[PDB]
Amino acid sequence: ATSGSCKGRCFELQEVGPPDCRCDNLCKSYSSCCHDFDELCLKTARGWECTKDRCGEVRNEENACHCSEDCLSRGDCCTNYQVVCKGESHWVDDDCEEIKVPECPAGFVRPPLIIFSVDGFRASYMKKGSKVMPNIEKLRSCGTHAPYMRPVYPTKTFPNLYTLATGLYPESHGIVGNSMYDPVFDASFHLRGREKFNHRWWGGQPLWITATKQGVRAGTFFWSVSIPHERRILTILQWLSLPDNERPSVYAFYSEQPDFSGHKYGPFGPEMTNPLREIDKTVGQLMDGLKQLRLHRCVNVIFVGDHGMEDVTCDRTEFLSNYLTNVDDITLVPGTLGRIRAKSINNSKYDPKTIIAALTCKKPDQHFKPYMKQHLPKRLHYANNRRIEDIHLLVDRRWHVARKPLDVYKKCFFQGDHGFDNKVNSMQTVFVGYGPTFKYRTKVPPFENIELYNVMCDLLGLKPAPNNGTHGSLNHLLRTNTFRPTMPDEVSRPNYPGIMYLQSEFDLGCTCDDNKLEELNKRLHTKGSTKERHLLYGRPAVLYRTSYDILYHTDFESGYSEIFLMPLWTSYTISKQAEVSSIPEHLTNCVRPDVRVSPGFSQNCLAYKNDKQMSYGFLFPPYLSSSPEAKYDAFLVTNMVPMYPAFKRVWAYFQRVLVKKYASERNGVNVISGPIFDYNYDGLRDTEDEIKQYVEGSSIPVPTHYYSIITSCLDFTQPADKCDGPLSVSSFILPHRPDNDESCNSSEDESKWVEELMKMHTARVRDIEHLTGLDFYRKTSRSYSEILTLKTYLHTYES
Ligand SMILES: *[C@@H]1O[C@H](CO)[C@@H](O[C@@H]2O[C@H](CO)[C@@H](O[C@@H]3O[C@H](CO[C@H]4O[C@H](CO)[C@@H](O)[C@H](O[C@H]5O[C@H](CO)[C@@H](O)[C@H](O)[C@@H]5O[C@H]5O[C@H](CO)[C@@H](O)[C@H](O)[C@@H]5O)[C@@H]4O)[C@@H](O)[C@H](O[C@H]4O[C@H](CO)[C@@H](O)[C@H](O)[C@@H]4O[C@H]4O[C@H](CO)[C@@H](O)[C@H](O)[C@@H]4O)[C@@H]3O)[C@H](O)[C@H]2NC(C)=O)[C@H](O)[C@H]1NC(C)=O
Ligand SMILES: O=C(c1cnc(N[C@H]2Cc3cc(Cl)cc(Cl)c3C2)nc1)N1CCC12COC2
Ligand SMILES: [Ca+2]
Numbered sequence: 037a038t039s040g041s042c043k044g045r046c047f048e049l050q051e052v053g054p055p056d057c058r059c060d061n062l063c064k065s066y067s068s069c070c071h072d073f074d075e076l077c078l079k080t081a082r083g084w085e086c087t088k089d090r091c092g093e094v095r096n097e098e099n100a101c102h103c104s105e106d107c108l109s110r111g112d113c114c115t116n117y118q119v120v121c122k123g124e125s126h127w128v129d130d131d132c133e134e135i136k137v138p139e140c141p142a143g144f145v146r147p148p149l150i151i152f153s154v155d156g157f158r159a160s161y162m163k164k165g166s167k168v169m170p171n172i173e174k175l176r177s178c179g180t181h182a183p184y185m186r187p188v189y190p191t192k193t194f195p196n197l198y199t200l201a202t203g204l205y206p207e208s209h210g211i212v213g214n215s216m217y218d219p220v221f222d223a224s225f226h227l228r229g230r231e232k233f234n235h236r237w238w239g240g241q242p243l244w245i246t247a248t249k250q251g252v253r254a255g256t257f258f259w260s261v262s263i264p265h266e267r268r269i270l271t272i273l274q275w276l277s278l279p280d281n282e283r284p285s286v287y288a289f290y291s292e293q294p295d296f297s298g299h300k301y302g303p304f305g306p307e308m309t310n311p312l313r314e315i316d317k318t319v320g321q322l323m324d325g326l327k328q329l330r331l332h333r334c335v336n337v338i339f340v341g342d343h344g345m346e347d348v349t350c351d352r353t354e355f356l357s358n359y360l361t362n363v364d365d366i367t368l369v370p371g372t373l374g375r376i377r378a379k380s381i382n383n384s385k386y387d388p389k390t391i392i393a394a395l396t397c398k399k400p401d402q403h404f405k406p407y408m409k410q411h412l413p414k415r416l417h418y419a420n421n422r423r424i425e426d427i428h429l430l431v432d433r434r435w436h437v438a439r440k441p442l443d444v445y446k447k448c449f450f451q452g453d454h455g456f457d458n459k460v461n462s463m464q465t466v467f468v469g470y471g472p473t474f475k476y477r478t479k480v481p482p483f484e485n486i487e488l489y490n491v492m493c494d495l496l497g498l499k500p501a502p503n504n505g506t507h508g509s510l511n512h513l514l515r516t517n518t519f520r521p522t523m524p525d526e527v528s529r530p531n532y533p534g535i536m537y538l539q540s541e542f543d544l545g546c547t548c549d550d551n552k553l554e555e556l557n558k559r560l561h562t563k564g565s566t567k568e569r570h571l572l573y574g575r576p577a578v579l580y581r582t583s584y585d586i587l588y589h590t591d592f593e594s595g596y597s598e599i600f601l602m603p604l605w606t607s608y609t610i611s612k613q614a615e616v617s618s619i620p621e622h623l624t625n626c627v628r629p630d631v632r633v634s635p636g637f638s639q640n641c642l643a644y645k646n647d648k649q650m651s652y653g654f655l656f657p658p659y660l661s662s663s664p665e666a667k668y669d670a671f672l673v674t675n676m677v678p679m680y681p682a683f684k685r686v687w688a689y690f691q692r693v694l695v696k697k698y699a700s701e702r703n704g705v706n707v708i709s710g711p712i713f714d715y716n717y718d719g720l721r722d723t724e725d726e727i728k729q730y731v732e733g734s735s736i737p738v739p740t741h742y743y744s745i746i747t748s749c750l751d752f753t754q755p756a757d758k759c760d761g762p763l764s765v766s767s768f769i770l771p772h773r774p775d776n777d778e779s780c781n782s783s784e785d786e787s788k789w790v791e792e793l794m795k796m797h798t799a800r801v802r803d804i805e806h807l808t809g810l811d812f813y814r815k816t817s818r819s820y821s822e823i824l825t826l827k828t829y830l831h832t833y834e835s
C-alpha cells in the first residue's frame with residue numbers, strides 16, 4: 037500500500053508494520069518502499085564530492101550531499117567537504133597518533149562501534165593489494181590486526197555473516213549454507229527469493245538484538261543491493277548526527293565487493309585491482325566523514341571479511357553421474373561442498389551406505405571425499421542440525437562437485453569461488469580493529485571469527501548471549517574493556533586409591549607373563565613422586581558429577597573413570613632424549629589387574645576375546661616406558677581402551693613413531709590422551725545413557741573418538757618440562773572407526789597416510805574440553821587470558 041510517504045523518514049531505524057509502506061535500508065529488497073523513496077532517500081544529484089565551486093553554496097535539498105555552510109550542523113556534508121572547502125587534510129594523509137582515550141563529542145555515552153564488512157576479502161589482499169589500499173593500510177598498521185581471521189565452515193557468505201553476528205557455529209545458528217531444506221518446516225531457503233526473510237531460519241541472538249535488549253540502540257545491518265556504497269556511508273554518518281537519545285551506538289556497513297568481481301575474475305585476476313581501490317575509497321569516505329564530525333578518535337572501527345576466494349573453473353568439476361548409476365534418485369546441494377539426500381522420502385530403496393561406498397576412493401585423483409556428517413573432522417562443528425544432510429562431500433580446494441554435466445552448462449563463466457574447508461589458506465579472511473578501545477600498532481595471532489561477537493559485546497558494554505566464543509581469549513586485542521574470566525569450578529573431586537585388592541579377587545580372563553633397596557622406590561612412584569614431571573599444568577578439572585580415581589605411575593598419571601571403566605585422561609611427558617622400545621614378546625597379550633581398582637570397576641579381557649570386531653589399545657604407550665620394569669605399568673587394565681583393529685594401526689603409529697618425533701622436534705612434549713563419546717554428534721560430552729555401542733557382552737563403552745593434547749615450550753630452547761614462558765600446543769580428535777576408508781592410501785605403510793589423517797583431524801584444546809567436560813591448563817605460570825588464547829589455537833598445517 038505504497039501510497040504513504042518517506043518524507044522525514046529516510047532510512048528510519050524502526051521498520052514499520054505493513055500495510056504501511058517502508059523507508060528503511062531493506063525496503064527495496066521486499067519491494068515495499070513508499071512511492072517517493074527514490075526521490076527523497078536516494079538522491080544522486082551532483083554526485084558525492086564537494087568541488088571548490090560548491091563551497092558555501094546555498095543549500096539545494098535535491099543534492100546527494102551538501103557543501104553549504106550549514107551542512108556540518110545538518111550532518112549531511114559530502115565526506116570531503118572540510119578537505120575541499122576548509123583546507124583540511126584527508127584522514128589517510130594524517131600521521132598515526134595513539135588513541136589512548138576516547139575523544140568524543142559531549143553527549144556520547146560510549147564510543148560507537150562501526151563494523152565495515154567486506155564480502156570475499158581474502159586475507160592475502162592486505163599484503164598483495166597494499167599499494168592500492170592506503171586507507172585500509174593505515175587502519176591496519178595503526179590499529180590492531182591479525183595476519184588472518186579463520187571463517188566458519190562452510191565458507192559461504194550468510195553462514196559467516198551470521199556467525200559474526202551471533203558468535204555461534206552454523207550448526208547452532210541454523211544458517212548452514214547459502215541454500216537449505218528444513219524437513220520439519222518442509223521449507224527451502226535460497227539466495228534469490230523471499231523464504232530467506234522468514235525469521236524461523238535465523239537462530240541465536242545477533243548483536244543488534246543483544247544491544248537493543250540491553251538498551252543500546254543499533255543501526256540496521258542489512259543494506260538493499262541497489263543502495264550505493266556512498267549512500268550507505270552518508271546514512272551512517274547522518275545517524276551519527278542524531279540527538280543523543282535517538283542515536284545508535286552500533287552500525288554496520290557491507291560491501292558485496294570484492295566477492296562479486298572475484299567470482300568472475302578469480303582472486304588475483306587483473307580486474308580485481310579496481311574493486312580493491314573502490315573499497316579503499318569507501319573506507320576513506322567514512323574516515324573523512326568521521327573526522328568532520330570529530331568522531332575519528334571516538335569510534336571503534338572494525339574492518340572484517342566473511343571468507344576468502346579461490347581459483348575455481350568449470351572444467352574442475354567432478355560429476356556424481358560418473359560414480360553413481362542411481363543419480364536421479366538423489367538431490368545434491370552442489371559446488372564447493374556437497375550435501376546429498378533422497379529425491380523422494382517415499383523411496384524405501386534409497387540406501388546411504390551404498391551411495392557412500394560408490395563415492396569412496398573410486399578414481400585415483402578424486403577431488404572430493406564423502407562423509408557421513410558425524411564422521412567429518414570435529415573442528416568443522418558441522419553436524420548437529422536437521423538442515424545438514426547426513427551425506428556430505430568435502431571438496432578439494434579449486435574444484436566443484438555437480439550431479440550431472442548438464443547442471444554446469446545449462447545454468448565458461450566463473451573463475452573464483454569459496455565454500456571449502458575453513459582451514460584452507462585461500463578461504464582465510466581479514467580483521468582490523470582501530471579505535472580507542474583497540475590496541476595501538478599491535479599484531480595479534482590469527483583467530484576464529486566465532487570469537488568476535490564477545491569482543492563486539494565488550495566494545496559496547498553488553499553481556500553476550502551464550503555463544504561458541506571463549507570469552508577472554510581475545511582480551512589481548514583490547515586496551516580497555518577486557519573481560520576478566522574466572523576458571524570454572526571443579527565439580528567432581530578425585531579419589532586417590534591405594535592398594536585395596538588381592539590379585540585373586542579379579543576374574544577378568546586376563547593373563548600376563550609376570551629387591552629391598554628399590555621396593556621403597558616404586559611405592560613412591562605409585563604415591564605420585566614423578567607426578568610433577570608427567571603432569572605439567574595441573575590435574576585437569578572434571579566439570580560434571582562423576583566418580584573417578586587418580587592413578588599415579590612412574591611414567592604417567594591418569595584420571596580413571598569408575599563409570600566409563602577407563603581413563604578420562606592420561607598425562608605423560610616425553611623428553612627429547614627419550615628412547616623408544618618394543619613390546620617384549622612375552623608381554624604381547626599381557627593385561628594386568630590394578631590392585632587399586634575394584635574388579636567391578638575394571639574392564640575384562642574376555643569381553644575383548646568374545647567381541648570379534650573390537651580389540652584394545654593403551655593410552656600411555658608401552659613403547660615409551662622409562663625402563664623394562666616401568667613397562668609393566670603400561671599393561672594395567674586401567675590403561676586399556678577399546679580399539680578397532682583398523683584404528684590400532686593409526687594409534688600404534690602415533691604412539692610408536694610420532695610422539696618421539698614430536699619430542700625430538702619440539703624439545704620434549706607433554707601428552708594428554710583420552711577417549712571421547714559423542715554419539716549424538718552435538719560436540720558435547722555424552723552422558724552414559726547416550727552411548728550406542730559397548731564391547732560385546734560388557735558395560736565397556738566404545739569411544740567415538742580418541743584425543744591427544746601435545747604441549748611444549750614456545751621457546752623450544754627450553755625443554756617441555758622446564759619451560760619458563762609461553763606454551764605451544766597441537767591437538768587432535770581422531771575418529772574411532774572400524775575401517776580406514778577415509779584414507780584412500782591406507783593399504784600402504786602408515787608412514788604414507790597416518791600423519792595426513794591426523795592433520796585433517798587437528799583440533800583446539802577447547803574442542804576437546806567441550807567433548808570431555810574437562811578443563812585443562814589449570815596450574816601454569818601464565819595469565820588466564822593467555823591460556824584461553826592457547827586453548828583456542830588450531831594447528832592448521834597449511835603451507
Ligand atoms: C555453541 O553455543 C551454543 C549456545 O550456547 C550451544 O547451544 C546450546 O546448547 C544447549 C544443549 O544442546 C541447548 O540447551 C537446550 O535447549 C533447549 C531450549 O531450546 C530453545 O531455547 C533457546 C533459548 O532462547 C534457543 O536458543 C534454542 O534455539 C535452537 O532451536 C531453534 C529451533 O527451534 C533454532 O532457531 C536455533 O538455531 C537453535 O537450534 C540449535 O540448537 C538446538 C537445540 O536447542 C538443536 O536441536 C539444533 O540442531 C541447532 O543446533 C531453542 O529454541 C532445552 O529444551 C534443552 O533442555 C532439554 O535437554 C536436557 C536433556 O536432553 C535436559 O537438561 C532438559 O530436561 C530438557 O529435556 C527435555 O527435552 C529433551 C529434548 O527434546 C527431551 O528429549 C527430553 O526427553 C525432555 O523432554 C536444552 O537446555 C541450547 O538451546 C543451545 N542453543 C543454541 C542457540 O544452539 C552449543 O552447544 C555450543 N556448541 C559447542 C560445540 O560447544
Ligand atoms: O546480501 C545481502 C546483504 C546485505 N547487507 C548485509 N549486511 C551485513 C553487515 C553485517 C555485519 C555483521 Cl558483523 C553481521 C551481519 Cl549478519 C551483517 C550483515 N549482508 C548481506 N543482501 C540483503 C538483500 C541481500 C541480497 O541477497 C540478500
Ligand atoms: Ca560472501
Ligand SMILES: [Ca+2]
Nearest residue numbers: 714720721722
Ligand atoms: Ca554428545
Ligand SMILES: [K+]
Nearest residue numbers: 644647650651
Ligand atoms: K576382539
Ligand code: NA
Nearest residue numbers: 776777779782
Ligand atoms: Na582406505
Ligand SMILES: [Zn+2]
Nearest residue numbers: 156295299454
Ligand atoms: Zn561469493
